[PDB]
Amino acid sequence: SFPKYKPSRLATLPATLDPAEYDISPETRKAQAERLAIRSRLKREYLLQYNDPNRLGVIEDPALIRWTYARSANIYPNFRPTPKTSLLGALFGIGPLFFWYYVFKTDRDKKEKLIQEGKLDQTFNISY
């Protein structure tokens, strides 16, 4: 009837436009129940320490610690040299260097060739 909205990576699909939430079945309701139960258990565990009058300091969150450890120290033990990893590493670590080397070498060679012929107009060029 009306023009359709198609989601993208940077403009995702709204909840009210999702077919998946308009055809439900009992196992989905059970899954939502367990999700809410997990959330409520974590909330209670947090709120018990949050309101404790004898609690002084920082409430340690294992989720934050796990996130930081995964982002920092777990990466190398779970690394394997694969064709994808090797190719991406070679590209992203070698290509830029040689690209910039070619660009700057070409520019400096052209400048030097101009200097040797004595035609660059270097007048008033005192400071270098």
């Binding site: 002084l56 920082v58 920092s72 830029p96 910039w100 700057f104 520019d107 270098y128």
Partner: protein, 459 residues
């Protein structure tokens, strides 16, 4: 110049003969007095250096570094007495002894007239730093960090030693003055290429150069606060000083031997500035900031022009002060909350307003706001690079944006927003920390007032 060296060797037994509760006061007072004494080296000439004796000399490039070292020792002393309160008296004296020995080695390194003596002292600086890192660091990574700090250095410096003695068997002298006056061009042969590499790689790994920098995040993150201060503000400048010294004998090979290192420096400056944008650790962000600034300094030294040398000297001084301030600011929050994650303690401007002002000034100086000496050095280096090649203004310009972003990012992450609710152990800022911040920041603007003191011999 023994009038500066001897008082430090006297700081040693004064610390070891002090009463158990008066070590910090005596050490800080006499270190401040030694800094006041060392202030007299800024009176330089316009033609040659200050040749005190056959062993030691002072130049317009080394005097600001000596002043910075002697000024940094008391700041380390104030920054260290908080987390070492529960330590025994003997171990506190040992820690102060390590700091004093490091200062003595750095003072002798920055004034040695001889390249082998410079090598010996510049290598002796490793032992106190390694002991500090691996003994008084907090987490179990410190041991590995020490190893990463050690061999990365030594693998770069042992070839240099060989090259050095080789030079002494060819020219007959390694004294810097004779080396400068009797300089001769380097031919284009494989032997000369490898001699160039041997002479350069040690200082390039101490900068550190991009690709050779992996030791620096470990060393600057697992170290205690004084260790991080001395590693970032002074020990990184050994590479710059050594390259500025040793480049007098490498011409005209540098003219084409600098291309791989220039490419690495520029692209890795961009890369490390980008890395700073996604960092969950607040200390690692400052470490990578140091990497980016030192990449700029490497470019300045490698292009070999008077403006580049002036800008490089100014940038080393400014970076030392700024990075030390940033490390201390991060350590205050760490001591409060015992965690290094940046998004843990948020909205601290509400709870600590003066600390937020200190953070704002440090971040504004980090992004090279005019007319700070950070900007003076950066702009001189950028002008020299533009003269070298007009296209560099792209990459440099890119960096100028990225730096600002991540700099303000840190501020906006730590000071603005809303405070974390469950963190209730944030006490008011002590007078010691505020004094530390003020003594870091006031010299920066005072040098901004008189910028020719940190512009080096090419001024």
């Amino acid at each position: 110049m023994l009038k500066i060296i001897i008082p430090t060797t006297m700081l040693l037994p004064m610390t070891w003969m002090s009463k158990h509760n008066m070590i910090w006061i005596n050490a800080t007072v006499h270190s401040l007095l030694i800094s006041l004494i060392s202030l007299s080296l800024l009176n330089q000439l316009g033609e040659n250096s200050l040749n005190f004796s056959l062993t030691f000399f002072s130049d317009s490039l080394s005097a600001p570094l000596l002043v910075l070292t002697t000024w940094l020792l008391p700041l380390m002393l104030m920054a260290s007495q908080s987390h070492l309160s529960k330590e025994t008296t003997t171990r506190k004296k040992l820690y102060i002894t390590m700091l004093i020995l490091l200062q003595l080695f750095l003072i002798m390194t920055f004034t040695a007239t001889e390249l082998i003596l410079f090598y010996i002292l510049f290598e002796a600086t490793l032992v106190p730093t390694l002991i500090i890192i691996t003994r008084w660091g907090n987490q179990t990574e410190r041991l590995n960090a020490g190893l990463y700090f050690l061999f990365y250095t030594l693998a770069g410096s042992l070839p240099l030693l060989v090259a050095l003695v080789y030079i002494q068997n060819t020219t007959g002298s390694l004294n810097f003055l004779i080396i400068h006056y009797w300089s001769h061009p380097l031919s284009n042969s494989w032997s000369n290429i490898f001699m160039w590499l041997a002479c350069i790689m040690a200082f390039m790994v101490k900068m550190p150069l991009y690709g050779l920098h992996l030791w620096l995040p470990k060393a600057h993150v697992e170290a205690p606060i004084a260790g991080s201060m001395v590693l970032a503000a002074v020990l990184l400048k050994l590479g710059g000083y050594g390259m500025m010294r040793i480049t007098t004998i490498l011409n005209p090979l540098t003219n084409y031997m600098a291309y791989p290192f220039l490419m690495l420096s520029m692209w890795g400056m961009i890369m490390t500035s980008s890395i700073c944008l996604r960092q969950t650790d607040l200390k690692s962000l400052i470490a990578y900031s140091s990497v980016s600034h030192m990449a700029l300094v490497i470019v300045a030294i490698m292009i070999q022009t008077p403006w580049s040398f002036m800008g490089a000297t100014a940038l080393m001084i400014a970076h030392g002060l700024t990075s030390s301030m940033l490390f201390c600011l991060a350590n205050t929050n760490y001591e409060r909350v015992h965690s290094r994650t940046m998004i843990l303690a948020r909205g601290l401007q509400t709870l600590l307003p003066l600390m937020a002002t200190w953070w704002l000034v440090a971040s504004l100086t980090n992004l090279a706001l005019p007319p700070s000496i950070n900007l003076i050095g950066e702009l001189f280096i950028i002008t020299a690079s533009f003269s070298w090649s007009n296209i560099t203004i792209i990459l440099m310009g890119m960096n100028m944006m990225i730096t600002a972003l991540y700099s303000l990012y840190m501020l906006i992450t730590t000071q603005r927003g809303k405070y974390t609710h469950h963190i209730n152990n944030i006490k008011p800022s002590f007078t010691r920390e505020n004094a530390l911040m003020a003594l870091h920041i006031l010299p920066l603007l005072l040098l901004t007032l008189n910028p020719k003191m940190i512009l080096g011999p090419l001024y």
